[PDB]
Amino acid sequence: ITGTSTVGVGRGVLGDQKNINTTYSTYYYLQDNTRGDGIFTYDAKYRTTLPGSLWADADNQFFASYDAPAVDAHYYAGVTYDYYKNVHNRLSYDGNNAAIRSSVHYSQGYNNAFWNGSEMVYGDGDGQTFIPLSGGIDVVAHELTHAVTDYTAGLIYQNESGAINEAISDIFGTLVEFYANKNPDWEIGEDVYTPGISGDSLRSMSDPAKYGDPDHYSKRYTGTQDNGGVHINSGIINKAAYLISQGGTHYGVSVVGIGRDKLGKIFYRALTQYLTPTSNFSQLRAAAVQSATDLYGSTSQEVASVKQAFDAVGVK
Ligand SMILES: CCCCC[C@H](S)C(=O)N[C@@H](Cc1ccccc1)C(=O)N[C@@H](C)C(=O)O
Ligand SMILES: [Ca+2]
Ligand SMILES: [Ca+2]
Ligand SMILES: [Ca+2]
Ligand SMILES: [Ca+2]
Ligand SMILES: [Zn+2]
Numbered sequence: 001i002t003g004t005s006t007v008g009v010g011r012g013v014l015g016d017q018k019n020i021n022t023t024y025s026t027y028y029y030l031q032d033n034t035r036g037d038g039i040f041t042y043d044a045k046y047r048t049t050l051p052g053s054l055w056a057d058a059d060n061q062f063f064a065s066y067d068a069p070a071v072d073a074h075y076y077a078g079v080t081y082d083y084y085k086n087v088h089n090r091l092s093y094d095g096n097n098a099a100i101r102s103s104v105h106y107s108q109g110y111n112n113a114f115w116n117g118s119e120m121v122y123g124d125g126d127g128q129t130f131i132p133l134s135g136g137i138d139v140v141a142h143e144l145t146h147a148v149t150d151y152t153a154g155l156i157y158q159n160e161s162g163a164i165n166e167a168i169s170d171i172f173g174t175l176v177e178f179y180a181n182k183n184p185d186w187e188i189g190e191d192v193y194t195p196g197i198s199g200d201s202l203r204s205m206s207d208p209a210k211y212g213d214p215d216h217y218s219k220r221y222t223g224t225q226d227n228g229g230v231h232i233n234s235g236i237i238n239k240a241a242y243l244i245s246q247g248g249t250h251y252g253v254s255v256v257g258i259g260r261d262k263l264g265k266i267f268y269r270a271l272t273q274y275l276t277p278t279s280n281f282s283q284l285r286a287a288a289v290q291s292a293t294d295l296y297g298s299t300s301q302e303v304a305s306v307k308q309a310f311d312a313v314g315v316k
Pocket of ligand 1: 136146173
């Protein structure tokens with residue numbers, strides 16, 4: 001919409017107050033003109049037609065319960081955009097400031113969120129398993145990272161390339177969470193998962209097994225469920241990333257951590273320069289090793305840690 005850029009105020013899913021960039025033209029719209037070609041948030045109104053209506057509000061104040069998921073989706077998309085721009089020098093998901101669109105209130109009691117190849121979509125959850133999914137910054141960052149992957153590696157969403165695709169989204173979803181410094185951790189979905197249970201999460205990068213996911217290649221899922229286990233086998237790569245960054249001993253193999261910033265640098269380089277649509281775990285290892293070499297030299301500790309971490313999870 002064409003209008004005047006302004007700043008509204010609202011309350012997110014978790015009840016936190018935050019300012020949001022809006023656009024004024026009769027109504028105040030959830031349209032952020034300060035980042036690239038814009039961030040647009042839509043109301044799917046409990047239906048499945050996308051994107052729905054660009055979010056319109058009469059007074060630029062978003063404190064209604066219906067508003068919460070929109071506020072967070074809009075706000076976190078902005079934070080995610082800043083992360084990629086500031087940390088990786090990437091302008092939006094396509095690298096050329098493509099408009100970022102998100103739709104909230106998708107369907108009824110929908111326990112998921114996803115990138116559909118064109119935009120991000122967020123369900124409200126059923127109130128038991130999940131609350132509105134945009135309330136989690138690792139969720140929002142996970143979805144937008146899928147867009148980055150679409151325009152770079154193009155990892156096919158099935159089997160090993162699919163598990164890599166998922167892991168990259170969890171890895172960057174986590175790095176964005178640390179970046180915003182929003183009670184950061186190496187857990188996935190803790191802010192919106194199971195409102196009745198404290199201390200849990202959907203997945204864990206530090207200890208995937210905690211939630212039944214493999215933490216070693218020998219325990220990989222080989223069936224056809226979940227597109228060949230894309231949300232299951234991602235645990236193997238998530239664990240490796242966690243080890244590269246934080247260090248630790250896993251299955252008797254010791255890894256010296258090199259930190260989050262270097263983890264992000266290595267993986268971003270692998271994703272954008274070396275990964276292809278059909279890359280498997282073994283190729284991811286080679287890509288990560290090559291990236292760390294380009295950035296830190298063949299005899300660097302960084303290259304050594306990447307090797308140890310993949311050895312620890314059994315990926316040669
Ligand atoms: C319906 C199609 C779903 C395809 C997969 C989407 S990208 C996805 O992975 N969504 C995330 C949402 C998420 C992200 C981070 C934290 C919590 C929840 C996801 O992991 N969904 C799980 C529930 C799944 O699809 O198995
Ligand atoms: Ca209002
Ligand atoms: Ca957290
Ligand atoms: Ca988290
Ligand atoms: Ca919970
Ligand atoms: Zn995903």
